[PDB]
């Protein structure tokens, strides 16, 4: 289930693409891996740009 760097849609140049990278996961205490995945909000139920339009 670990992301295996194939799912990454790279934007860095070709010479910067890792040949073998694994996502850091909370199993094994995050002590192994190469990258992480960030998201804007933990739970995403509302559109922020709509709140601006409402006010």
């Amino acid at each position: 289930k670990r992301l295996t760097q194939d799912d990454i849609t790279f934007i860095i140049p070709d010479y910067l693409r890792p040949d073998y990278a694994l996502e850091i996961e909370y199993y094994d205490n995050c002590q192994s891996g190469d990258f992480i995945v960030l998201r804007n909000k933990p739970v995403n139920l509302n559109n922020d740009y709509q709140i601006i339009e409402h006010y």
Partner: peptide, 23 residues
Amino acid sequence: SEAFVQLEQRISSLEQRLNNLES
């Protein structure tokens, strides 16, 4: 052969962990 892929990932993780631990 997803099981072999999982085993390879586990071994690579262990190698990285031990290499980081040594230094």
